[model samples]
Each structure stands twice: as structure tokens, then as C-alpha cells.
Target: MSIDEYKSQANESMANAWRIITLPNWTVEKRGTVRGDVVESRKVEGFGKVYRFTGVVNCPARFLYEEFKNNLTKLPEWNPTILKCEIIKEIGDGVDLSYQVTAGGGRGIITPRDFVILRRTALLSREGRVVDDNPHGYISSGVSVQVPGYPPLKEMVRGHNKVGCFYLQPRTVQTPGGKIEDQALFQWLMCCDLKGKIPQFVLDVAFATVMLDYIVHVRKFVAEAKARAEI
Candidate 1:
């Protein structure tokens, strides 16, 4: 497909994501103790199940956004399941073609999976917001498909990552001691196909755990790194 076609599809996918995530029928699946993050899952007839992770982090939205964009190769350091991640090609302005391999986890031994994805990301500065002076934020969305002619890996199964989207919004507040700080609200949504006999409940728990852990780690990593840079 042409680059223009891919761009159009990416835009449509983000729009659909926004609509679906806002639906009132989402069933609460799990709530994490860390930062009170919540995981919600909903079944989209024909497409499979969709999962969402929503939470807040005590860090600037731009900090996390830049971390995600700049640290794709370092993902495995924090996300244990991801064995490899790299950008194979840059499309343009926050869009790229990338590859990733992840290890499947559960009670039994499962084969690792890999895929190639087209990723599009954007940062919406405060001026873009309706509410003036709102903190800058970012959004990233992507779709993965099997690239024909790409030889299969010896030990990894080809996987499909249909669509995924992340939204970040920043807020600034004052403490009782007259200190100012920044916090970010985060929302992540993804739909994918899993080929296995694993029970849906098991997958739900695993996904939720991974998502919550990942964000929490990101918050910590970025905050510490930013502080060190300032010092």
C-alpha cells in the first residue's frame, strides 16, 4: 500500500479507538493497587476482544511521550516480555515502520511471537487544546501485519497486532506547601489476535499485569532520568 493509504488507515484507526474507549458498556476487569490503574475489556464482535489501561502518573506528559518515542530499543529493559524492538524504517513526522518480538508467558511454555508494525505518533501542544494553558500531551497509534516475503523466524510465530492507541494528557497542580508539580493521565487501547488455547481470563490477567507494570516503570524511569538531567 502507498504511504498515503497507510496514513489514512492510521487516522481512521485512531478515530475508532477514541470512540470505542468512550463507550459506556466497558466491563471493569481489574484494578491495580499501583496508582489505582484500571484495566477494562470489551468484546468487539468479529474483531475479537479489546483491552484498555487507564491511569495517572506523577510526571510530565511530554517526558513520557519523549521517552516512548526515543526509547523503543530500550523497551525490553523495562518490559520483560519484549525481547526485541527496533525501528526498521522512518516514514515521516512521527511515523515509522518497526519490528518487535515478545515472549509469551503463562503456566506452560509458549513460543515467542514477532511482527512488523506501522506506527504513527503526534504531540498536541497546549495551544491545540480548547482549554488554554492545558499541558502538552501526545497520542500514538499503530497497526501490525505480516509482511509478505519476510522470512519466518526459526523459533518465533508470526503474530498479528491489529491496532493499538495511547493517549496522554498532562495536568499541573499545587501542593499544600505551595509546591507545583506535573502529572499525566494515560489511556492505552489495543486489539490483537492470539492463537492459542489459553483461557480468556488468563490472558486478561496477564495483559493487565504487563500494562500496569510497564506504565509504572515508565513513570519511575522518566522521572528519575529527568531529575538527574537537571542536576
Candidate 2:
């Protein structure tokens, strides 16, 4: 189903969410999903340092929560950066996942490398009961080397709930002359659980295209920066 069709079906359901979750940043921006909201936003800056931009996804909290809890591996089927993933170890409340990604044009076409991540749910409430479990908590998933032989590393943190998914992220890599290249920030919100068929499919396609376009833009930025430095 396309995004428009999905919206028709979800129109009532989405209205229900708005009545429940009160936030100043909420707005209706139609991309793939007809309903898009910015739950939060912030900016950081420093001299000669990269500024990090962060935002939150405004989607169905319950649907997103269930998806992350059960179908994380299915992400690659929709998300392009992830080439492959598998759960290697699961002990008690924690899980270990192995993953690989394709190097983009900026990194020069190269084979993928494997990394691992550990994830566990957190219980958030006065009682701290698993019954009041909040899927939003800090969990470490594997690592990636932006540059060969780098220390300090890059990691991924994925979270979900009735609000939306919040990915808290930071990356550090060793550059020449022992300088550390790093960036830290949270990204946007993606909505879930719609009604119309066509709208849902269209929404999925739009999201995919936007993500691919973002990769191209980042590659161009990297190339221009390197050229300006005469590298």
C-alpha cells in the first residue's frame, strides 16, 4: 500500500495519538507518512569543530516499540546502509548482534567489515518494574572503524517507545597527527502503523529515496572538504 492510502486508514488512529501526546514541537509535515512531527531539536557548536544536529522521530510509539523489540533484523530490508546482520549471542536480558555495512564513495568502495552490539531493555518508572518497562534505554551495539587502526570507535544505540525511536549516537576516529575526528548527535523520527495501502507503500519509497539522497549529500561534503585542504 502507498502512503496516501495508509493515511486514510490511519487518519483516526493518528488523531488519537495527538490527543494523548502533548508536545510543542508537534506539526503535520507530509513526506511518505502524512503525519510527521519533531519531538525535539538542538544544536551544538565549537571552534574548528563539527557541529552536531539532532532531532527525534514522531511516529506511533506502540508500533515502533513492538517492531524494534521483535524485527530489528528486518531493518536491512528497508534501510540501505545495513548490508547484513545476525544475532550471535543472547544471554538473559541482553543480546549480541553482528553487523556489516558498505563503504560509501567518500570511503572509496571497499568490502564490508563485521561489528557487534549488545542490547538490553530498561524499566523506567517509580517502581522500576519490568511491567513499566520503557524500551528507551542505553544499549551498546557493535563497533565500526571509520579509519583503519582507530581507537575510541563508533557505536550505535537504538531506542523506541510510544513517542518514537531515538538513536543516541557518537563516533570517534583517530586521524593523522593523533587528532581525533568525532561527531555526536541524534537524528529524526519515522512514523508507523497506517491505514491506506497505497499511502503506506509510497511512504516507504519516499523514506528510502530520502535516505539515499542524504548519503550522496554527505559524500559530496566530504569530497569538497578534502579538496579545499588540497588533500
Candidate 3:
């Protein structure tokens, strides 16, 4: 991506980021609720189906940000339907090559999928900003990139993430006793090409369920750990 394109992207709002990063005319196609919130899906040409799930995780943005970066090896524990997540190489500052694996479908009837991605992970803030408690908090943006050292495994399809990003914004929540507490707006968005023989309808259902399961597990992970931190 050109620097200008990425500049426009980083400045966009959550709604516009999806539009600018992926494609246009993405109207909401409902599948079902994900943790009581709707999972938005759209039928993009190449990606088949792109899904987004936004929810509130009862943990500080700092906690979630650290969990994503430092706990890369622990992703399989918190992230459902993902088999692996590892940093392949540190190519640049805040930019590295990472590999990921998605769980197989149809009880192995559909083999697993993997991606070798070049990603950038950092805190997002507006110009002249001096704090972390902004609308744009932590952003992990990436897409598949060719890596000579790692080739596609014969056992798994090599998927491609045309657009993949996570946005976690810090916010305060008021309790029953008028106590203020830390929390985050968790936004997960992705558009990818899961190469192989697959039907669009099947992919649609799969991605939607994937997003739902993801949010549920993240809550289970961060909230529990947040409790331990408090204690």
C-alpha cells in the first residue's frame, strides 16, 4: 500500500476504515447476534464474505494490547477457531512477518488454512495527541505477504488476508455505585481469500460463527486475567 493510502486509512473512523480498507457498497447482511450484538457480514467479490464483530470487553485497552502482542503464543488459548499464531521474523520496527492458522472446517473434511502476513502493530492517536485514552487506541493492521523462508504447508490451504485489522480504544464505564472503571471498544475486521474449493454460503456461515466465537473467547480471556490483576 502507498503511504498516502495508509495515511488516509489510519485517520478514518471505525466505519470508514472498513470501507476504505476493503471495498465499497458493504451493506449489512445479518446472520445472528454475537454476544447479543449483531455480526455484520458482506459479500465481497474475491473475499467471498467479510465479517466484523464489535463488542465491549471488560478490560483496559492496555491489557488487551499487551495480550495481543506479548501473548502471541497464547492465542490458541483465547482465540477460538485459530490453531496457531506466531511471529516468523522481526523485519522492521513495529512491522514483522507473522504466521497464523485457522481451524479446519467440517471436521477436517475441509482442511485448515494458514497465512504468512506482514503486519504493523502500534498505538493510534491523532496528530499532536499526548495521551492513550483516545478513540483510536491500539491498531494491528496487516495483510498477507510472500515469504521465501516459509511456504504453504501441503496440509493447509494458504489463505490471503486482503484486509485485516483490530482496533482497541480505551474508555471508562460507570458502575452502580457511580464508580468509574476501565474498559475497551473491541473492533475486529477482516476480508480474506480462503483459497480452495468452497461454497459462498458455507463460507458465509463459517465466518459469522467464527466472529461470534472469537468475541466470546476474548471476553473470557481478558476479563479473567483482569480479575487476577485486580486481586
Candidate 4:
């Protein structure tokens, strides 16, 4: 099938799945939901700091594996958080995916006009074996998606993006000066499916709703955690 046809079919299937999972009476509503399986963890010593991180969400095992086995331009559909993306170049099965994302801002007319442009590249299709034991034939993979900046300070700036990048990283330990930093990084590669047979544009709207809900949930979780910590 052509990439366009695959995208259409995959999007349809995904939309139906999303509806199934998100329905008010669905299991996800009562028992919670697991979007994707977790994969790997790492500890890195960079500059003078010890950084720990882990990668997750090997797309091959998630969904649309057959379709994306070759083309990745459709990532924008699944990863709604990304504003824009493109493959830098292709070498065999591997390709360089570069993207720019915007976080924080008001909607309609009151939204903030300022947007931080974060540019990062991911090397896909590199030879590797799956270490996380995910069942979907997802081979081992690594991703380097970071905001261009320094530690704690960089994290602080990341607050603008709802501390998304920070949370995805690995855990941190405390220093002698009481300063805490990440010892590892964590990332969530979620695959969503929409319900019913919807048009592509309609699917996009549903995806946007899911994305907004994610943002809202994150904000609330952060706020509650802060309040509890203060107590």
C-alpha cells in the first residue's frame, strides 16, 4: 500500500482504538491505561555531572508497525506534541528525524506569542536488539531529544514546556549541597487509536483533544504534587 493509504487506514484504526480506550465506561476509565511498554534505562557521566536516563516507546511494537516500517513522516499524527518535523536524510532503513516543538502559551487571542524552538534529531533503524522485552517486534532503539541548555537551569526553562522533558529523564540523586539532579531519564512513547470510522481531519481533532487532555493532566498532577510537597 502507498504511504498515504497506509496513513489513512492507520489513522482510522487508531481513532477507533482511542475511542474504545477512552470511552467513559472503558477499562481505562476505571483501571487506568498503559499506553506503551517501558524499555530501557541508562546512567551517563557528562561534563562534571552524572546523568541517568532511559528510553521507551519503540514504535515498531506499538502500532502501525507495518506502515511505518518504511515511512516516518506520519509521526506528526501520532506525536501531536510535535509542531513540525522532517526526516533529515535516509541511509538504508535508518533515517534522521528532526523536529521543532512549541510549549506553553495562551489560546485564541491571549496566547503567548513567544515560542522556544527546540531542535533535536533521532536516529532510527540503527542495528540493535530489543532489551525491554516489548512484544511487538520493536527492536532496540535510542533517542536523544533534549532542549539545548544546561542542567537545573535547563530544567527550569523546561518548566515553560510543562516540565515535560524533565519528567521523561531518569531519576536524580541529591548532592552534598542539597541540590538534586536527574540520575536517569524517562520517556513515554504512547500510541493512541481513535474510535469509529472518522475522516482524517476529524481524527486530527480527536487527537488534539487527547493531547490537550494529556497537557491538562500533567499540569494538575504537577500542581498537586507541589502542594503535597509543601505540606
Candidate achieving the largest lDDT:
1
How high is the CA lDDT of each candidate model?
0.72, 0.33, 0.66, 0.29
Candidate 3 lDDT, 43-91, residue by residue in tens = 6554556677667878888778777766776899777678989887764
Instruction: Look at candidate 4 and tell me the lDDT of residue 199.
Output: 68
TM-score, one value per model:
0.82, 0.34, 0.76, 0.28
Model 1 error, position 197 (Å): 3.5
Clashes (N, CA, C under 3 Å) per candidate: 0, 22, 0, 23
**How high a TM-score does candidate 3 get?**
0.76
Over 4 Å off in model 3, which ranges?
A: 1-26, 30-36, 42-49, 105-111, 126-135
Order of the predicted models by lDDT, top scorer first: 1, 3, 2, 4
Q: Tell me the lDDT of candidate 4.
A: 0.29
Comparing 2 with 4 on TM-score, the higher-scoring candidate is 2
Any residue pairs clashing in model 1, and if so which?
Answer: none
Comparing 1 with 2 on lDDT, the higher-scoring candidate is 1
- Full-model lDDT, candidate 3: 0.66
